[PDB]
Amino acid sequence: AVALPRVSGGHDEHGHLEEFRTDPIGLMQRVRDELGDVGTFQLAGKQVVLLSGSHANEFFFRAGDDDLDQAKAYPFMTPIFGEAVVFRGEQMKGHAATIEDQVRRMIADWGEAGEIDLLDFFAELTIYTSSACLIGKKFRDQLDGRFAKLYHELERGTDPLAYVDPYLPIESFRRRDEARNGLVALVADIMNGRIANPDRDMLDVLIAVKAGTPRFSADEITGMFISMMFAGHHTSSGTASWTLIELMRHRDAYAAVIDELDELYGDGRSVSFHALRQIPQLENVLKETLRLHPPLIILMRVAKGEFEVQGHRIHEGDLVAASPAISNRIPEDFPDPHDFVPARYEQPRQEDLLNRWTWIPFGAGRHRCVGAAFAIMQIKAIFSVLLREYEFEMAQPPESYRNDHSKMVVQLAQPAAVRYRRRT
Ligand code: HEM
Ligand SMILES: CC(C)[C@H](NC(=O)C1CCCCC1)C(=O)Nc1ccncc1
Numbered sequence: 104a105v106a107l108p109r110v111s112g113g114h115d116e117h118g119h120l121e122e123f124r125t126d127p128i129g130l131m132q133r134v135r136d137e138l139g140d141v142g143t144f145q146l147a148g149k150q151v152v153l154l155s156g157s158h159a160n161e162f163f164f165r166a167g168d169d170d171l172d173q174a175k176a177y178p179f180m181t182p183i184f185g186e187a188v189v190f191r192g193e194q195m196k197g198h199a200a201t202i203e204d205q206v207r208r209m210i211a212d213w214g215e216a217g218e219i220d221l222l223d224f225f226a227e228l229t230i231y232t233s234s235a236c237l238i239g240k241k242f243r244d245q246l247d248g249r250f251a252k253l254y255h256e257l258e259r260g261t262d263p264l265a266y267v268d269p270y271l272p273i274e275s276f277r278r279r280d281e282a283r284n285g286l287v288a289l290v291a292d293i294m295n296g297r298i299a300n301p302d303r304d305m306l307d308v309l310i311a312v313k314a315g316t317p318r319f320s321a322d323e324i325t326g327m328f329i330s331m332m333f334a335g336h337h338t339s340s341g342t343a344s345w346t347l348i349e350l351m352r353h354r355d356a357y358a359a360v361i362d363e364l365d366e367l368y369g370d371g372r373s374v375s376f377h378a379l380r381q382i383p384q385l386e387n388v389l390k391e392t393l394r395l396h397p398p399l400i401i402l403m404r405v406a407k408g409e410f411e412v413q414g415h416r417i418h419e420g421d422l423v424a425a426s427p428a429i430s431n432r433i434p435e436d437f438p439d440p441h442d443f444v445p446a447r448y449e450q451p452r453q454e455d456l457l458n459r460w461t462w463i464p465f466g467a468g469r470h471r472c473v474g475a476a477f478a479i480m481q482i483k484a485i486f487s488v489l490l491r492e493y494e495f496e497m498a499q500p501p502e503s504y505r506n507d508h509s510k511m512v513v514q515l516a517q518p519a520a521v522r523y524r525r526r527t
Contacts, residue, residue: 118145164468176403179265185326239304256282387445397427
């Protein structure tokens with residue numbers, strides 16, 4: 104009957120929802136600043152118990168699906184995956200080679216010098232890497248920029264208003280729904296193309312299954328492919344963007360990465376060899392970029408039961424959340440937490456390893472990211488190519504690069520303009 108501590112503000116119609124839709128990171132920080140390790144905010148009719156700090160995070164991440172339910176906290180993903188999506192080491196070398204090929208293909212028309220937008224570039228690139236690795240090169244080769252454009256609209260369909268109702272007549276939801284129909288149409292044209300113009304991939308596997316009448320429709324197959332690509336797409340896309348931004352903002356780090364790439368590749372081995380082995384300075388830049396710009400800024404659960412955390416009672420049906428955005432910057436755990444300090448991961452400090460429950464850009468415990476090794480390899484492969492072929496400079500003030508946090512799916516904001524010039 105005791106109310107949990109509640110953060111200030113949230114006097115709008117849906118409580119803190121409006122703030123969560125505009126500045127979720129400031130809201131979550133205020134929870135911690137006012138209340139400490141366990142505090143709440145109101146998301147429309149739902150209480151969110153926001154945990155932070157080592158002890159509370161440990162509870163969150165060590166909880167089994169019996170205690171804290173992940174999938175129930177994401178009902179808004181239903182219109183994205185669709186009705187019927189009811190939610191290896193031996194391959195990695197091949198995937199690194201695939202990634203190298205996709206990056207070379209993306210920069211093939213760059214020429215001597217030019218300008219890119221990082222969101223446009225990395226969003227499209229990572230559609231190709233994800234589709235090629237997860238579904239097949241044959242399928243990627245039947246994709247072009249339209250698939251990326253549509254997939255982006257789908258991701259933009261995750262306004263937190265979806266916690267009120269995911270089918271409200273707002274434009275972002277209408278565009279989410281239309282984008283999904285557009286993706287189904289692309290997949291149907293691909294299926295038809297294969298009939299008329301017959302080396303196999305997962306799409307071939309799915310087409311072959313019989314109910315015989317074919318078992319799966321374009322709609323069903325498309326939902327499967329959307330779901331397969333979702334976790335790794337915006338996360339990898341944003342991380343690649345922020346990696347390049349932070350290298351440009353910190354030229355000393357950029358210079359060290361260049362030297363090391365040039366030294367490492369001097370053994371004559373491929374990207375598929377080196378992307379699976381240490382590239383130390385780049386890896387520490389990546390760790391720091393993830394600490395500062397975690398693409399998942401909040402992680403949601405529904406409590407299945409009663410638990411106590413620091414003498415605060417969580418009850419069944421409470422939404423319960425952790426936040427990499429906030430936890431990754433706890434100043435007692437990460438000295439100078441707003442500063443970009445790749446040295447914090449060198450053997451002497453290992454701040455990622457020592458702070459097991461608060462360095463959480465890839466989660467922790469029971470829910471440690473199963474895609475982390477792939478995502479890390481993919482950054483290594485991408486930058487092994489980009490940084491050896493081209494030099495990059497910022498085309499706008501360094502502090503003006505920023506994320507759009509208005510949707511549950513975080514995206515780099517535009518402009519994110521960067522110039523390149525061939526390395527001599
Ligand atoms: C840089 C890219 C990525 C980041 C920052 C990231 C982040 C995370 C985070 C924060 C969690 C914990 C989720 C939670 O506790 O609710 C997680 C778990 C997970 N991620 Fe990722 N992820 C990335 C890429 C990927 C990729 C490429 C895949 C696979 C295609 C993937 C699949 C998963 C899976 C299967 C889990 C386990 C969920 C659980 O058991 O709790 N992720 N990831
Ligand atoms: C947070 C996003 C809305 C999105 N979440 C999801 O796609 C799932 C919803 C239900 C099952 C858990 C996650 C997502 O991209 N999640 C992940 C991305 C990565 N790695 C792990 C999860």
